[PDB]
Amino acid sequence: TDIMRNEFERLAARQPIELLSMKRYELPAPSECVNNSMAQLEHQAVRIENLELMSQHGCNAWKVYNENLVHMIEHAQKELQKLRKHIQDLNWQRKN
Amino acid sequence: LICSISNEVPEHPCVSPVSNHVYERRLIEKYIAENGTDPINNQPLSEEQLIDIKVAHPIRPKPPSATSIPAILKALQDEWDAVMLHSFTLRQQLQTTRQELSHALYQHDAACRVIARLTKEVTAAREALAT
Amino acid sequence: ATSIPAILKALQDEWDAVMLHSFTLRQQLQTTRQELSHALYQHDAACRVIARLTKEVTAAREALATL
Amino acid sequence: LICSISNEVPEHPCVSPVSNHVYERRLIEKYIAENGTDPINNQPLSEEQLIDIKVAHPIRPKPPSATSIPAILKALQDEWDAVMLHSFTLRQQLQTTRQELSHALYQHDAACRVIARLTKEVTAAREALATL
Amino acid sequence: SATSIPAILKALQDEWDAVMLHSFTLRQQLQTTRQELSHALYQHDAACRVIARLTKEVTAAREALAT
Amino acid sequence: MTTEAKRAAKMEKKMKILLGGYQSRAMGLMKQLNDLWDQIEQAHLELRTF
């Protein structure tokens, strides 16, 4: 019950083929390229800016996610116990 | 800690007041517009009925070796591969469960007829000893 | 039409359906597994009724036969 | 990860359904038994209204990572929304340079007519005086 | 459009590829308009030094005409 | 490209050294969570069975 999204998604999975991305930026060639050069400079600047931003977030946050992921994990295994205790009781009852 | 629709770790979790279950806002907002009821309990629920919750925020460490290039090419490609080959394999799992359902119920009803056939057999054999 | 910001908005809107579809597909997945599990357990449970019944029926035969 | 009332790491988290915030069950239970209210917003709340944290249901999740499709899409918003501000830094600075260039080229065009007349007048004064 | 989805992947690739160059071309033009502006400021201040010597040659001429 | 990507590679390798360890740390946690969510359903299913 979805729009166009479902038609191309089901076709991609059925055919077993992922849609090709931009295989351009990595290769390139020395000696149109004035634009391609100016793309690279801006991208590099963003990476430094993103790297600083990423490092800046990673630098202090690098472990913040881990702290949150440990609170998320322990909650599941508490449920595992609560389910374990009910079922055991039921089994015991049946046995008796 | 997770969303009860997609299997996400929500960025803006919101709880419904009819059934205490945390959903990611976008996914619960979509369900209410599709059909105005709670997805789990099938109880009447609206967009105003929801209550947004707050937490210390979730942090993902963007890989150190990251850029516009892998994020456009390699990472996004793997995400639509992993979505495609999983749901196709999940559709394969649902098809076999229904086939293995039919082998279960037939073998069950086959056993019922054996019991019914042996219930007439045993008590009449015991009755014959009484006679 | 061929801009940029709304393409990402469109990408969200189609994903919003993807999540809603995966939910209803999983509900029926697990809700059917409950019927599968309760049946298989109760089947092999009802199967042990026969094993018991067959051996008693058998005991009634040699008893009456030898008498 | 924290309890908002005490500030400890809660060993039994239960989320309220009036002010969305993760409280420790043993702490919030005593707050409700004191008076039927939510500590933050002071809205009415009972013990049955409070709900423990649970595994969603039957859909399996994975932790929040950079791979995950939704986290990757919200990343590309950060990319473009930051690059859009990068364009303002160059659009705003261009409107100062071209505005200073416009007044500079006007002062150049207003001045060079006076250089042309003094080169005329100082040579005309040398043409006049030398002949006499 | 109905547009194939594998193609929509390569569109978003091209559109980011285009915006990266449309941001680059707009920055090197800003640096060269400021650079060519700085070449005008040197000529502006160099010209008003050359007018001071030309005014002296006119002042020297007005003294000789009087004599 | 020279100035920025050299800074990027320095920023990356400085981050990577600190964060590839924290990535591995994070990845494990995520995997564990996923696994748990898998045991949760089997116990709920078996709870409703029993």
Numbering used by the authors:
A (entry chain K): 63 to 93, 105 to 169
B (entry chain r): 3 to 133
C (entry chain s): 68 to 134
D (entry chain q): 3 to 134
E (entry chain t): 67 to 133
F (entry chain L): 703 to 752
Lines quoted from the article behind this entry:
Pre-mRNA splicing, executed by the spliceosome, proceeds in two sequential steps: branching and exon ligation. In exon ligation, the newly exposed 3′-OH of the 5′-exon attacks the 5′-end phosphate of the 3′-exon, releasing the intron lariat and ligating the 5′-exon with the 3′-exon. In this manuscript, we report the atomic structures of the human P and ILS complexes at average resolutions of 3.0 and 2.9 Å, respectively. Comparative analysis of these three late-stage human spliceosomes reveals the molecular mechanisms of 3′-splice site (3′SS) recognition, exon release and spliceosome disassembly.
